[PDB]
Amino acid sequence: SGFRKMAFPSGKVEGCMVQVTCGTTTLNGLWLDDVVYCPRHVICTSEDMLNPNYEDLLIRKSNHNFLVQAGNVQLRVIGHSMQNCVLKLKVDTANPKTPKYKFVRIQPGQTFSVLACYNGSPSGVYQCAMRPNFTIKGSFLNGSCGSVGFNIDYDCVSFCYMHHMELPTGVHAGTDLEGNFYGPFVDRQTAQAAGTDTTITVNVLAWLYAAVINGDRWFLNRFTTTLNDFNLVAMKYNYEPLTQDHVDILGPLSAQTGIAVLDMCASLKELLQNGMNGRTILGSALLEDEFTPFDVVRQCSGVTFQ
Amino acid sequence: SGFRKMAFPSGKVEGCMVQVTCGTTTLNGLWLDDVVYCPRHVICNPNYEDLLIRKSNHNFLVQAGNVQLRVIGHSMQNCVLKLKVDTANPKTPKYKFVRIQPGQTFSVLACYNGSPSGVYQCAMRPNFTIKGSFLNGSCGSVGFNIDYDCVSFCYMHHMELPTGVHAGTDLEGNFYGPFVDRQTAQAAGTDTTITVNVLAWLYAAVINGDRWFLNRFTTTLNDFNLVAMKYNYEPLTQDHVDILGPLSAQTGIAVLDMCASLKELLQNGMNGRTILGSALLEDEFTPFDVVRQCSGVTF
Ligand SMILES: N[C@@]1(C(=O)Nc2cncc3ccccc23)CCOc2ccc(Cl)cc21
Ligand SMILES: N[C@@]1(C(=O)Nc2cncc3ccccc23)CCOc2ccc(Cl)cc21
């Protein structure tokens, strides 16, 4: 019983974190095999940030300009290349702690754990979701650049995010591990803003199924809805449209609890209309959207508390 | 910017988790040096001394990854079983066993079959339970804090109470709360809100640019404590006021000034507003957790 925002154990990622310094800029790098991956803005000197020409800045650098530190050991850079917004530093030592890993690009609504780091040293771990507006609501201070997001389903680390910047509203933007930004963001200090964000509907439904599994049904009602009528109502509350793929994905939770997906949609519509009336759902007074259907299945019991 | 429920990095603890099997019962153990610590109910009105004397070392199957450790001795200390093994854990971090107080927070590395599954942050409630997330087989999972390079183990999971909350012991086997390790009628007592932690979280909200709840008013500690008693909030002591000193100096809001804000929030609610993305007053961040997250301390 219980339901917490649960991160993956961070040990496999901690053994990959390094400090990368280029001139006066210091940030974090991810050391996998003989390559250290880090944001390419480590080569910018703050003024450069308005309109940096990364190709022009990088050509003026040699391997010895990049100082990489793994614990109290200096790694030697023997090559460098830029792939999109990531710098790949070839080092002369393969990381003996390299876990089994993959680079994966995620879709909005997907969750992942973030190992926040400063100076190549891990500070904390928390759970995050890729917002529909492609930002993440993280907890990052200056120097956190290069911290990574990941999942560890079945002892393989799937790296999905590398931290690059903080937008004016306090939210965060970054890239996949191939250096492609999530969202329309650029690694420039030009005027940029997060678009209007929306609630991840499929995740809220998953969390309502988690509440039923843990024993709570107060919010259910005798009604159902069509998918189209649900979306027409949900769009009015700034909720993401629910697609047939989302209905399919919720199939297992629907079968475990005996509540049809469109019947859970009717409960959500009513919650949006009425609010919670002094009640809570899984210790929350707000509808939670940072648990996916997969996260609920991972954490919750396979037996509903009837 | 941002404020999340953040756990300590779990790597130093992951390298200590093992699977302990005795008969049909399988749970988790903590392997430090040449000893594996686990709940004594793995041997299971139980007379633990009588049940343990009937066991031999070879009855305890301990597995660290895909390697079987051999048990060469066993002893009980309160509600923890200490299994002496022939191999010292080469991954043993610098550590201490500490007993925490209600209101203090810690990270939990939830495990099943000696394999870590997740990490989350929680607080020892004033009623000595924790609002964890544990399923059958999670017994022996541990709670900890990290100070510099030293892991301070403070909790070992033993059981789930009927309300879905959890109970356990420190690493010396002393339960937190009036609980016993047996199948008998037990219940969590009425819980209260950790006042000093709510104030710490309000300071975190102010640091993050959430100031709508601030007001021109102040209060005495005695008048605030009358209000705290009314809403099932723990009393705020002069020690708590002292502990909040740094956050008070950073934000320019006196501790008693923040108390008048909390009093108004208790008497009037949030009125459709949120604080740090929450519609409830959050009490599972200590003042130290706020300072650490708003300063980027590393391990
Ligand atoms: N290094 C920058 C940044 O956002 N850095 C921070 C990241 N995360 C969190 C931060 C919190 C506070 C201050 C800074 C933070 C500094 C500001 O200009 C840009 C612009 C573009 C890019 Cl790609 C990076 C930055
Ligand atoms: N092994 C017991 C337990 O509570 N174990 C669980 C722990 N966490 C979570 C659980 C979730 C579901 C079921 C079981 C859980 C099962 C019930 O009887 C006792 C009695 C005394 C003690 Cl010390 C332990 C247990």
UniProtKB/Swiss-Prot annotation, chain B:
> What residues form the catalytic site here?
41, 139
User: What happens when you mutate residue 183 to A?
Assistant: Does not affect ability to cleave and inactivate human TRMT1
Query: How does its activity get regulated?
Result: Inhibited by pyridone-containing alpha-ketoamides compounds 13a and 13b. In turn, alpha-ketoamide 13b (tert-butyl (1-((S)-1-(((S)-4-(benzylamino)-3,4-dioxo-1-((S)-2-oxopyrrolidin-3-yl)butan-2-yl)amino)-3-cyclopropyl-1-oxopropan-2-yl)-2-oxo-1,2-dihydropyridin-3-yl)carbamate) inhibits SARS-CoV-2 replication in human lung cells. Inhibited ex vivo by michael acceptor inhibitor N3. Inhibited ex vivo by compound 11a and 11b.
Covalent cross-link Glycyl lysine isopeptide (Lys-Gly) (interchain with G-Cter in ubiquitin) as placed by the record, residue numbers:
5, 84
Q: Which reaction does it catalyse?
A: TSAVLQ-|-SGFRK-NH2 and SGVTFQ-|-GKFKK the two peptides corresponding to the two self-cleavage sites of the SARS 3C-like proteinase are the two most reactive peptide substrates. The enzyme exhibits a strong preference for substrates containing Gln at P1 position and Leu at P2 position
| Cell compartments where the protein resides | Host cytoplasm; Host Golgi apparatus; Host nucleus
Pull the Cytoplasmic topological domain ranges from the record: 1-299
| The Peptidase C30 domain, residue ranges | 1-299
Lineage, top-rank taxon, reads: Viruses
How the protein assembles, per its UniProt entry?
3CL-PRO exists as monomer and homodimer. Only the homodimer shows catalytic activity. Interacts with host FBXO22; this interaction promotes the proteasomal degradation of nsp5.
What this protein is reported to do is described as: Cleaves the C-terminus of replicase polyprotein at 11 sites. Recognizes substrates containing the core sequence [ILMVF]-Q-|-[SGACN]. Cleaves and inactivates human TRMT1, preventing tRNA guanine(26)-dimethylation of tRNAs. May cleave human NLRP1 in lung epithelial cells, thereby activating the NLRP1 inflammasome pathway. May cleave human GSDMD, triggering alternative GSDME-mediated epithelial cell death upon activation of the NLRP1 inflammasome, which may enhance the release interleukins 1B, 6, 16 and 18. Also able to bind an ADP-ribose-1''-phosphate (ADRP).
Q: What is this protein called?
A: 3C-like proteinase nsp5
Naturally occurring in which organism (per UniProt): Severe acute respiratory syndrome coronavirus 2 (2019-nCoV)
Full-protein residues shown: 3264 to 3568 of 7096
